[PDB]
Amino acid sequence: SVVKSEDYALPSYVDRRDYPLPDVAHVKNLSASQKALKEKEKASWSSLSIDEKVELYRLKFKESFAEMNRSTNEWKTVVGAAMFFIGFTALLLIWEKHYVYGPIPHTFEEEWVAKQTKRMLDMKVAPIQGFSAKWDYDKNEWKK
Amino acid sequence: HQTHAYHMVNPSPWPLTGALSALLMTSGLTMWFHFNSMTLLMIGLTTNMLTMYQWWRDVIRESTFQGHHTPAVQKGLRYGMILFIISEVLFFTGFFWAFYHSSLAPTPELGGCWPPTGIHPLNPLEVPLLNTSVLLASGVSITWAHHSLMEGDRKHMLQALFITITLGVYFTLLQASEYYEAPFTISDGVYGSTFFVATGFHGLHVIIGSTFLIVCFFRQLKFHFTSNHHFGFEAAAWYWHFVDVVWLFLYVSIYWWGS
Amino acid sequence: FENRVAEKQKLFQEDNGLPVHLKGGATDNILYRVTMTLCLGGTLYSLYCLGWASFPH
Amino acid sequence: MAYPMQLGFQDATSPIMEELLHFHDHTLMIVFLISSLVLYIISLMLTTKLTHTSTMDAQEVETIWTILPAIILILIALPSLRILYMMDEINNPSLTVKTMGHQWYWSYEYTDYEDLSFDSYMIPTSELKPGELRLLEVDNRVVLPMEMTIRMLVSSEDVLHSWAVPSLGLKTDAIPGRLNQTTLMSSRPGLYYGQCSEICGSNHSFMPIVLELVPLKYFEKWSASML
Amino acid sequence: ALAKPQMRGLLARRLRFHIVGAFMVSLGFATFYKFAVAEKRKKAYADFYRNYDSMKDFEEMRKAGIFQSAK
Amino acid sequence: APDFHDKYGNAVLASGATFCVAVWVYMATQIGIEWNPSPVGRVTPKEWR
Amino acid sequence: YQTAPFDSRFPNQNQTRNCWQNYLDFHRCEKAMTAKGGDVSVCEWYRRVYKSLCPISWVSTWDDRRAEGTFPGKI
Amino acid sequence: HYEEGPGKNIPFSVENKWRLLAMMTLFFGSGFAAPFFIVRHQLLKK
Amino acid sequence: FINRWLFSTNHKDIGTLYLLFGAWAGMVGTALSLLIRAELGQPGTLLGDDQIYNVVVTAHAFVMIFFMVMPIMIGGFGNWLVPLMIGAPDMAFPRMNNMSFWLLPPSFLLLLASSMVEAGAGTGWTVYPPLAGNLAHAGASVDLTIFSLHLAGVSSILGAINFITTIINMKPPAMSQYQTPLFVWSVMITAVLLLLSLPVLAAGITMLLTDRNLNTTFFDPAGGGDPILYQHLFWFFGHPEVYILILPGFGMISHIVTYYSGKKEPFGYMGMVWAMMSIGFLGFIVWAHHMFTVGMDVDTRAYFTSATMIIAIPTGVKVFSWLATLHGGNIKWSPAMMWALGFIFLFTVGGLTGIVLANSSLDIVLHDTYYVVAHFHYVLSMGAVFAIMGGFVHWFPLFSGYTLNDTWAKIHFAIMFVGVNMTFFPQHFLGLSGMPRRYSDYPDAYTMWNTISSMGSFISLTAVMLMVFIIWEAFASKREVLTVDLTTTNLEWLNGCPPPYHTFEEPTYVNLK
Amino acid sequence: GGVPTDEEQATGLEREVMLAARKGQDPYNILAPKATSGTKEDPNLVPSITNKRIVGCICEEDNSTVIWFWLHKGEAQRCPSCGTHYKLVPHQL
Amino acid sequence: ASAAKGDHGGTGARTWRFLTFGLALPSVALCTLNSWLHSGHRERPAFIPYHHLRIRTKPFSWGDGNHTFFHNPRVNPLPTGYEK
Amino acid sequence: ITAKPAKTPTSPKEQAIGLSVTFLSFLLPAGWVLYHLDNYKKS
Amino acid sequence: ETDEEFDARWVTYFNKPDIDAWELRKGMNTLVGYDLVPEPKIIDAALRACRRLNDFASAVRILEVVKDKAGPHKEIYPYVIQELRPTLNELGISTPEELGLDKV
Ligand code: HEA
Ligand SMILES: CCCCC/C=C\C/C=C\C/C=C\C/C=C\CCCC(=O)O[C@H](COC(=O)CCCCCCCCCCCCCCCCC)COP(=O)(O)OCCN
Ligand SMILES: CCCCCC/C=C/CCCCCCCCCC(=O)O[C@H](COC(=O)CCCCCCCCCCCCCCC)COP(=O)(O)OC[C@@H](O)CO
Ligand SMILES: CCCCCC/C=C\CCCCCCCCCC(=O)O[C@H](COC(=O)CCCCCCCCCCCCCCC)COP(=O)(O)OC[C@@H](O)CO
Ligand SMILES: CCCCCCCCCCO[C@@H]1OC(CO)C(O[C@H]2O[C@H](CO)[C@@H](O)[C@H](O)[C@@H]2O)[C@@H](O)[C@H]1O
Ligand SMILES: C[C@H](CCC(=O)O)[C@H]1CC[C@H]2[C@@H]3[C@H](O)C[C@@H]4C[C@H](O)CC[C@]4(C)[C@H]3C[C@H](O)[C@]12C
Numbered sequence A: 001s002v003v004k005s006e007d008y009a010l011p012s013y014v015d016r017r018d019y020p021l022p023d024v025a026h027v028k029n030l031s032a033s034q035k036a037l038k039e040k041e042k043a044s045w046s047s048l049s050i051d052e053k054v055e056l057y058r059l060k061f062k063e064s065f066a067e068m069n070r071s072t073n074e075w076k077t078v079v080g081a082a083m084f085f086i087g088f089t090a091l092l093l094i095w096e097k098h099y100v101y102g103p104i105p106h107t108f109e110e111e112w113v114a115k116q117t118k119r120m121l122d123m124k125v126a127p128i129q130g131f132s133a134k135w136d137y138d139k140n141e142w143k144k
Numbered sequence B: 001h002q003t004h005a006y007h008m009v010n011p012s013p014w015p016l017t018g019a020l021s022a023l024l025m026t027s028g029l030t031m032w033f034h035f036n037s038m039t040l041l042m043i044g045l046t047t048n049m050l051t052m053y054q055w056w057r058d059v060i061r062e063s064t065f066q067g068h069h070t071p072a073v074q075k076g077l078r079y080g081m082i083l084f085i086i087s088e089v090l091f092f093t094g095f096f097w098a099f100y101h102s103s104l105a106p107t108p109e110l111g112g113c114w115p116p117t118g119i120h121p122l123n124p125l126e127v128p129l130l131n132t133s134v135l136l137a138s139g140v141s142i143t144w145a146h147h148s149l150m151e152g153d154r155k156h157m158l159q160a161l162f163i164t165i166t167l168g169v170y171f172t173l174l175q176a177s178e179y180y181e182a183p184f185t186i187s188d189g190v191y192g193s194t195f196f197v198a199t200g201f202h203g204l205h206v207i208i209g210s211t212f213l214i215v216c217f218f219r220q221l222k223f224h225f226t227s228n229h230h231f232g233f234e235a236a237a238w239y240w241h242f243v244d245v246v247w248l249f250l251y252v253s254i255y256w257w258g259s
Numbered sequence C: 001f002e003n004r005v006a007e008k009q010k011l012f013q014e015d016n017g018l019p020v021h022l023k024g025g026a027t028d029n030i031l032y033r034v035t036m037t038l039c040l041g042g043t044l045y046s047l048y049c050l051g052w053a054s055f056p057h
Numbered sequence D: 001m002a003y004p005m006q007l008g009f010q011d012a013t014s015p016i017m018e019e020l021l022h023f024h025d026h027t028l029m030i031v032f033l034i035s036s037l038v039l040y041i042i043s044l045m046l047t048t049k050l051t052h053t054s055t056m057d058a059q060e061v062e063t064i065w066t067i068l069p070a071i072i073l074i075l076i077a078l079p080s081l082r083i084l085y086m087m088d089e090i091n092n093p094s095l096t097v098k099t100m101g102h103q104w105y106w107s108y109e110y111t112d113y114e115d116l117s118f119d120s121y122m123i124p125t126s127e128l129k130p131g132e133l134r135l136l137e138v139d140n141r142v143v144l145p146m147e148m149t150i151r152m153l154v155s156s157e158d159v160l161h162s163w164a165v166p167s168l169g170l171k172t173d174a175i176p177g178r179l180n181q182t183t184l185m186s187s188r189p190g191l192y193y194g195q196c197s198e199i200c201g202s203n204h205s206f207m208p209i210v211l212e213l214v215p216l217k218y219f220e221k222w223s224a225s226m227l
Numbered sequence E: 001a002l003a004k005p006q007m008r009g010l011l012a013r014r015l016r017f018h019i020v021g022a023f024m025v026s027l028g029f030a031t032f033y034k035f036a037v038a039e040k041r042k043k044a045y046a047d048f049y050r051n052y053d054s055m056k057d058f059e060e061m062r063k064a065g066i067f068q069s070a071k
Numbered sequence F: 001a002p003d004f005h006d007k008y009g010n011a012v013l014a015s016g017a018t019f020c021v022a023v024w025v026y027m028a029t030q031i032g033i034e035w036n037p038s039p040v041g042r043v044t045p046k047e048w049r
Numbered sequence G: 001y002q003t004a005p006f007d008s009r010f011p012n013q014n015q016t017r018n019c020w021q022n023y024l025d026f027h028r029c030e031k032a033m034t035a036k037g038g039d040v041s042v043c044e045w046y047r048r049v050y051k052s053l054c055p056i057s058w059v060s061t062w063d064d065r066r067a068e069g070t071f072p073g074k075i
Numbered sequence H: 001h002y003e004e005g006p007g008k009n010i011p012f013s014v015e016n017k018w019r020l021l022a023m024m025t026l027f028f029g030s031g032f033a034a035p036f037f038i039v040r041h042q043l044l045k046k
Numbered sequence I: 001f002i003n004r005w006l007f008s009t010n011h012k013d014i015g016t017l018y019l020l021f022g023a024w025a026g027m028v029g030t031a032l033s034l035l036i037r038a039e040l041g042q043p044g045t046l047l048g049d050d051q052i053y054n055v056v057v058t059a060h061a062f063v064m065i066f067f068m069v070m071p072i073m074i075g076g077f078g079n080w081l082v083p084l085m086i087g088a089p090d091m092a093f094p095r096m097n098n099m100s101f102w103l104l105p106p107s108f109l110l111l112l113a114s115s116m117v118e119a120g121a122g123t124g125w126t127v128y129p130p131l132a133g134n135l136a137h138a139g140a141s142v143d144l145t146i147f148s149l150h151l152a153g154v155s156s157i158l159g160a161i162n163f164i165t166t167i168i169n170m171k172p173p174a175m176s177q178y179q180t181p182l183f184v185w186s187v188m189i190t191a192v193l194l195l196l197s198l199p200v201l202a203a204g205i206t207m208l209l210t211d212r213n214l215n216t217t218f219f220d221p222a223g224g225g226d227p228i229l230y231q232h233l234f235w236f237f238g239h240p241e242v243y244i245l246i247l248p249g250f251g252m253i254s255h256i257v258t259y260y261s262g263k264k265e266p267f268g269y270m271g272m273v274w275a276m277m278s279i280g281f282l283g284f285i286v287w288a289h290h291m292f293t294v295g296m297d298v299d300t301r302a303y304f305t306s307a308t309m310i311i312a313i314p315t316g317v318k319v320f321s322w323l324a325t326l327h328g329g330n331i332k333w334s335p336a337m338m339w340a341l342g343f344i345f346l347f348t349v350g351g352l353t354g355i356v357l358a359n360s361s362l363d364i365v366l367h368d369t370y371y372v373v374a375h376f377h378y379v380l381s382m383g384a385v386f387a388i389m390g391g392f393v394h395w396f397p398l399f400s401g402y403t404l405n406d407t408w409a410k411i412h413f414a415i416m417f418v419g420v421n422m423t424f425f426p427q428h429f430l431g432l433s434g435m436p437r438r439y440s441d442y443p444d445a446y447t448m449w450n451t452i453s454s455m456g457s458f459i460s461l462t463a464v465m466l467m468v469f470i471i472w473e474a475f476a477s478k479r480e481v482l483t484v485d486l487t488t489t490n491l492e493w494l495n496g497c498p499p500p501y502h503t504f505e506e507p508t509y510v511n512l513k
Numbered sequence J: 001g002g003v004p005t006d007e008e009q010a011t012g013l014e015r016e017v018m019l020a021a022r023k024g025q026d027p028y029n030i031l032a033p034k035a036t037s038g039t040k041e042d043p044n045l046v047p048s049i050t051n052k053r054i055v056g057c058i059c060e061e062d063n064s065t066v067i068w069f070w071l072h073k074g075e076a077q078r079c080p081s082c083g084t085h086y087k088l089v090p091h092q093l
Numbered sequence K: 001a002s003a004a005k006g007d008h009g010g011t012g013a014r015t016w017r018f019l020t021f022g023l024a025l026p027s028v029a030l031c032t033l034n035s036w037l038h039s040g041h042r043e044r045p046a047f048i049p050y051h052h053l054r055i056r057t058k059p060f061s062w063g064d065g066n067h068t069f070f071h072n073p074r075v076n077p078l079p080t081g082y083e084k
Numbered sequence L: 001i002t003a004k005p006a007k008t009p010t011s012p013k014e015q016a017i018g019l020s021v022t023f024l025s026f027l028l029p030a031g032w033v034l035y036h037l038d039n040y041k042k043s
Numbered sequence M: 001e002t003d004e005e006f007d008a009r010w011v012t013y014f015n016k017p018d019i020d021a022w023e024l025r026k027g028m029n030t031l032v033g034y035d036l037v038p039e040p041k042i043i044d045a046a047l048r049a050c051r052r053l054n055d056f057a058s059a060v061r062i063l064e065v066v067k068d069k070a071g072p073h074k075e076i077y078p079y080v081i082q083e084l085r086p087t088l089n090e091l092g093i094s095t096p097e098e099l100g101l102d103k104v
């Protein structure tokens, strides 16, 4: 039961798949019937009942393999909370866009962009693959 | 109660006063260079001297007076001093690098030659050669000092160490006079820059080393050193040889090959 | 001169609980106070100077 | 120039730039491959309940993961170094142009024949003509003949700058007291843009480079007209 | 009665099987890469220049009014 | 005894995800951010000279 | 003459000494002629090469210093 | 000697979690804030 | 209080002071980074022209490198762990150790002074002249910056002397160097790099100081000097500096990966030692890969390309040995392990883009562009930082005696992972397509990648704020440690959590056999 | 003459170490102990000044991995890796 | 200097061996690669009968007295020029 | 690692308070400066 | 050394008549670090050692770790139990499944 901080220099109990027989028993102090049980254990194990066998297991070890190895729902909390905080980050960006960011330059206006685009096409910006390559100069349209 | 041989040092205020002194000296140079005042600087130099004084005083208390320097502790101090000297060598290396970079490819502004047009170097056979013999000589006398100490001879130790110190002092006075007599200055392009900055830091180390030798002198006077245990003296001797060797490199590089 | 090292050893090994930097006696306390006062005073001064320098003149 | 959402290099305008594109494809393939091998092996190590926790002998697998990488580096160095020495070969320019960096603009000198020189300043944003590019245009462009080998010499008259034109694969630092050489050859007419590529103070962002590449005859008349 | 299964070196066996898999997958990606990226690029540049006419290109640019030096 | 995750796991995940998607979709499309996507296939070029 | 030819004495990226050397050569040559009182046009190649390679501010500054008596090179 | 053990080997008190909150807030908060105020300082300068 | 915290001669307490200072520096550096991305997150001018912008860029770098990473890794984890991992009673020079600490807050103060006087030092953390000279940067800022670096240099040079001496001289007599854990190796190698590199930096910035104040002309062509000489002297230190920044991280990673794989030892211990030493040696002969556009002769450029690439070999041995350590582990998915695994992959990516940059022919186009910024934030803001966060969550219970909430730490990892990748991945695109470094504004074409990169940085901000709350929660809840696995191969834990003030007063017993 | 020797002038711990070494003793753990055969009849005897001391076991020559554990006063304990036996022999200096 | 290495804890065979295989032989292997690379004969230069070269003040004590001890027909011309 | 249960438990509510106070301490001072940027700069 | 020699060393290790409790733990904790599920004859010898040590609990734990070491190879554990049946019966050892200890 009770593990104590002043016991740290002493061998301790652990449930680990790769360390199946820990350095000490889970429970060391024994009641009267638990003491009788350990005596009964010195005789044929066939005479032990199921409940007795379980009790001996639970004195020696805390959790069984199936218990110590079980999966959990923790992943739901981690992914959900992460998304929640990432969502909260978007609030910060909204506030910044609203109170800090002035108007962007006039060169992003739709008409400027259409004109800049034609000029880029007239000077043949990136004509091999990048940009003008995607315009059809014969049909005067974007390559379909 | 410890059962190792290492030294647990009493809580000390000197690391902090040392650090604050570093702040006062750097802020002080800023104020000097840019705000026409020397006040911070003078305070900083002062606290720095007091820090070194008390810190090293304490190391003496701990060793000579309290016996904390076991062989294992002394062995660390030996490593400590070797490493510190290595870092100083690297420091000088940066200045020798600068010197060779500028002198080996003299630019058009210099006339494309080394020494530059309009520079008249000192004659390396004159006071620079005398300086060279002075520092080599002091390396001989400090070795006599060391052997006298290990042979338990107090008088000859003190006399050899005195000679060693006097030679350091002489070198320093010779250099100061040479600095005054030199017809070029720190502002004479890269020639004056490399010359004065490299030999100036060297001169600073000679002063530091001579001071360390003088500390050893007075400790010897007070019977601190035993014939077998005298690390302060060994360290000052290693540093002293470091100072001599750096001179040899400067003499060969700047005074002789660079003339 | 004479060897007074033993007397120094006696003094600095005295079991009075004092840190090494103060163990010499009252002079240590004064030198410490002078040093610490210069460092702390000079440090406040450096901050005044930073305040001053942080604005145009 | 760069276009919106560009992922890779600007299209090559010179044979050396095309060379760099292919070398980069070659190297990037190795990069993607190694990083995906590492991500994969990691996921592999981490997806089994089987254990083996006893001391393991390294005295052989270290051969593999030391020789393989050695071989890969060589497969990179070979073409890398062929290109390096390519860009160093003797070529014989027809024309030499100097550019001098300044805070914050470039000046250009074409002094093979006449004394032609001029300053080249960014077009301020409020003065852009419709369809012009913010931060990229200059009042006076660097007119040059196309399909010809040009020696560019680069220096500065104040702080560091660096003279760059990505589509030609060019970047040469501008250092006061020094005269750095690079060669330039455009396969195509057009306008080719770059930007100052060494921090140089308040308007580092705003001293661009525009080359205008045209037939020699137009370049000659342009030169004459700028005297 | 159940047959005896392999009981030894199960980790090493998974390891070998998947390393060989990763190898095969890597050559499949290289093949794919120097086909959809490298060759594609070499061929765009080759195709573009095979019959490129720089004067004609210049003439279009000049007529669109892009040049300071050529109207 | 069910722990925090058995109790709240499902709600944390569902509401975390729903909120994140909502606010990011809103930030991205509704407050005037300039993404400057490519004009390829979207812009009609227009006479500039 | 189109521009300065490749010069195997200065094959690298730093061309500073190429400009300097040819500037020296031209004014040395010029002095040799002008002296032994003769034909300065024999020096033309050096003047072409350095005008091609050398920044205008460098030439101008070196000219000013030659006139001033402070040019640090030997002519 | 000095106090030893959890919450005692540190220069700040963790005896009260709300006082600790205030302290950590001023500590981390002053660090994060400082560049904003230096920028402002510089802008309000010219 | 003053005796303990201002006059310390204890390795644990001084480590704790370094951790607090580096954590505070971390918040400063973060704020600077957000100012950068706030400016870049929309086209146009937010803060002012390039001067104030690059004052921020410059301070961001100096704070992250000199005040966050080095103190945390070397002053903090180094002081706490190194003496414990070798069973030593303290560092060799416990009082000199305290001065290395106390030099740092004055250094940081000088950096703050620089940004407050005049117009700040808008020079780049490389401080190149002539921009950094007395004409283009007249007044006290650059000198305040030089002095700040001098103090930080002295702090690390004395620290390095302390670490090498301690690690050479204070092992149990039976312990050879080949029986010390990889973290101790990593700290010693790092200290040798500091010892040799910082004094070259000191010489070079001292020459800058005298050019600015004593009319020397080391870097001024008018006196026969050369701006390029400064570059050589700086980078002769600067490249080792980056190995100094990652090596203690490699050491931690090794301990973390071994530990959460349930292994008693790292795969190929002697290959790991070989790799760190090789990387340390190679790190001194490659500096001019930072100067490929300055106009260097071609053979010189061929050598620096080849020498730089060779570092991939030892580095690849470490990466593969971490993988081999995982192999067959009983894998524990702790938050620390997640930081370590993220480290392995992301460091690798960043190392590989370093290999791209090593190719001087390509570097012509990549130099001084965001491709370089992407390279180095992968190795620093993922590499160095992930190693730090991993070490921090792993050893927090050793240092404090309390546990963190593992669920919260996992959430913090997830947020950070998304943020940093969103920040830096798109910068590869910006670099390839030619956006330059140290720009307050960019041509409109670059808008999209910059907007997304800036959103990334805000996500990292949220993670940073969450970390602070997580540390608070740990101290507020006081879950005291009881039991820790694998102490037989992790000596630093064997004295309990937190260890007593004095440990190893009676040294360990180790037979020679 | 005139120069003190260590015999005459060495003090504090330095003196203790010097005298103890004279007597072939190692109360300050300067030297590495030599292993016995490590059996239960012939355990490595581990001196201590309390009732527990940390032991590091280099199981085989040249192992880089050291095995660390508290040795307590009482029955001999075994290294959890190689099983060699150790026994605390507490108290003194 | 210190190099970048580190060890030193104790001077032993193991350290020197570690340096032999981990530094020294790898260095030789690299230099071997570098040579097994720049190898490949070179375009021998035109013969010029310079009087300061191909010295003959006395016949060599072997062969026909006019061939140097390690004469290489491909790169060492005689005083009268190359052979074939 | 194993640990004891918290000596001074922090409930969901107390954590909400700690988290909110933490975030505000970073966000408010910065928000104030940025918000008044126009007035500092765009003077 | 062959597989058979490996198995034989381990059978012998656990078969030592006066094997103590430390040696039993050391044996199983070492064995499960290998890349293998122990042969039935090895497990048989360790179970018999549990009996001589009067430790029923460890015998059951040993069966759990056999199952654990097989990882996703679900056919291994049933085979080994099938092979151990006579020993289980002889010694009165109940399986983790018979004891309900396979439940999460
Ligand atoms: C922690 C920091 C850190 C680290 C570890 C590195 C590591 C490396 N760096 Fe980086 N670097 C920086 C920080 C760092 N760097 C900074 C801050 C700058 C800019 C400074 C400034 O200008 O302000 C910079 C700049 C920089 C440049 C300059 C680009 C330019 O300015 O033009 C170059 C190019 O050579 C470079 C190269 C490398 C290489 C080859 C490595 C290698 O060490 C990486 C080796 C690792 C791997 C290769 C991955 C693992 C290996 C394998 C999985 C094996 C298989 C791999 C292969 C076969 C390739 N770095
Ligand atoms: C005979 C030996 C003399 C020793 C030195 C004497 C006086 C200076 C004091 C200390 C010198 C220390 C370092 C050297 C620094 C600068 C140059 C000093 C060398 C020197 O003394 O040069 C003199 C000029 O010095 C000058 O500017 C005077 C400058 C005075 C202020 C010193 C500069 C302070 C800045 C140093 C920064 C220190 C950085 C160190 C960091 C290390 C690691 C952190 C030469 O005189 P000149 O008239 O130009 O020519 C002579 C013509 N008749
Ligand atoms: C203008 C006039 C003054 C100029 C000011 C410039 C500064 C000058 C400072 C000069 C250096 C003085 C050093 C004094 C050290 C005395 C303390 C000491 O030497 O301590 C010794 C230990 O070594 C130790 O710490 C060795 C300690 C290391 C000493 C380091 C010395 C170099 C300092 C470098 C500072 C210069 C900065 C460099 C510039 C770039 C004590 O042990 P032992 O000697 O074995 O004694 C024990 C026996 O008695 C027992 O039998
Ligand atoms: C631009 C202006 C910048 C200003 C920066 C200067 C800042 C501060 C200067 C003032 C501080 C100096 C005060 C005295 C310091 C003495 C340090 C010392 O002497 O440290 C010794 C260890 O280092 C050793 O030996 C060997 C190492 C000794 C080094 C001496 C310390 C001075 C170093 C300053 C110069 C930096 C180095 C430059 C390298 C390029 C002793 O170690 P402690 O832990 O104390 O004791 C251990 C006990 O067992 C002793 O009994
Ligand atoms: C780069 C890191 C930054 C991340 C983004 C920060 C986003 C959240 C910051 C919130 O900060 C507050 O926001 C205000 C408004 O929303 C403020 O009120 C300002 O405006 C109020 C109303 O509009 C006035 O009443 C007040 O006086 C006040 O000045 C302002 O003070 C500030 O503290
Ligand atoms: C006073 C002392 C003799 C008594 C003693 O040993 O304590 C002697 C021995 C060595 C002497 C010193 C050495 O002879 C070296 C110096 C010689 C100079 O002529 C006088 C000062 C000088 C430094 C001497 C001063 C003093 O007389 C010393 C120190």
Ligand code: CUA
Pocket: D101, D102, D104, D105, D160, D161, D162, D196, D197, D198, D199, D200, D201, D203, D204, D205, D207
């Ligand atoms: Cu000019 Cu940047």
Ligand SMILES: [Cu+2]
Pocket: I238, I239, I242, I286, I287, I289, I290
């Ligand atoms: Cu580098």
Ligand SMILES: [Mg+2]
Pocket: D162, D197, D198, I293, I367, I368
């Ligand atoms: Mg650059």
Ligand SMILES: [Zn+2]
Pocket: J057, J058, J059, J067, J079, J080, J081, J082, J083, J084
């Ligand atoms: Zn052992």
